[PDB]
Amino acid sequence: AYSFKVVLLGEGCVGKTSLVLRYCENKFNDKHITTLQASFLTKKLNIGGKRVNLAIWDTAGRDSNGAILVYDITDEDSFQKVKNWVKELRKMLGNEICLCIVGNKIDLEKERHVSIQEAESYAESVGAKHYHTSAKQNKGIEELFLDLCKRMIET
Ligand SMILES: Nc1nc2c(ncn2[C@@H]2O[C@H](COP(=O)(O)OP(=O)(O)NP(=O)(O)O)[C@@H](O)[C@H]2O)c(=O)[nH]1
Numbered sequence: 386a387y388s389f390k391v392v393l394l395g396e397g398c399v400g401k402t403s404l405v406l407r408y409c410e411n412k413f414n415d416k417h418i419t420t421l422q423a424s425f426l427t428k429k430l431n432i433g434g435k436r437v438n439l440a441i442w443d444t445a446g447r448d449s450n451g452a453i454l455v456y457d458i459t460d461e462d463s464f465q466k467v468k469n470w471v472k473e474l475r476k477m478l479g480n481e482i483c484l485c486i487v488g489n490k491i492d493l494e495k496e497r498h499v500s501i502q503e504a505e506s507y508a509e510s511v512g513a514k515h516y517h518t519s520a521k522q523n524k525g526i527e528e529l530f531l532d533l534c535k536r537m538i539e540t
């Protein structure tokens with residue numbers, strides 16, 4: 386009965402499709418197969434006795450209730466690029482949209498080049514919540530989507 390549209394955004398190597406494929410199929414690919422077109426899948430959840438249909442839109446590289454802005458923790462450049470989307474989404478929809486700033490590939494912690502403090506403090510500064518995930522190890526994905534849904538219900 387709750388119906389939310391959520392979009393995944395981020396640079397070309399951050400793992401947008403990998404997050405969705407793991408969450409929805411329990412699968413993961415080492416090959417980067419670049420997304421040529423936006424596509425959706427619907428996740429059904431019950432939260433607080435309420436049914437939720439979550440339309441998750443993956444993107445090729447105004448409607449949305451939430452946006453998942455994915456970066457690669459080993460790639461500083463991928464993190465800074467998130468900030469453009471934040472600026473654009475905030476200009477468009479203000480604080481209405483639930484923003485997630487997601488550091489993916491936490492399995493590659495050994496090669497981290499984005500500071501967690503900067504990531505989290507930046508997230509807070511734009512009214513966003515920060516999240517850590519790995520599509521490869523299936524960590525933090527269940528909770529990302531769940532938390533985003535809870536947050537989208539609060540309005
Ligand atoms: N180690 C590790 N590699 C990951 C993780 N998530 C994705 N990758 C890798 O990152 C690469 C890009 O993944 P992909 O999901 O295709 O990214 P995308 O954001 O959809 N790219 P595009 O914009 O081209 O569609 C792949 O080689 C994939 O295996 C992760 O959590 N850990």
Ligand SMILES: [Mg+2]
Pocket residue numbers: 401402403418419420443444445
């Ligand atoms: Mg993709």
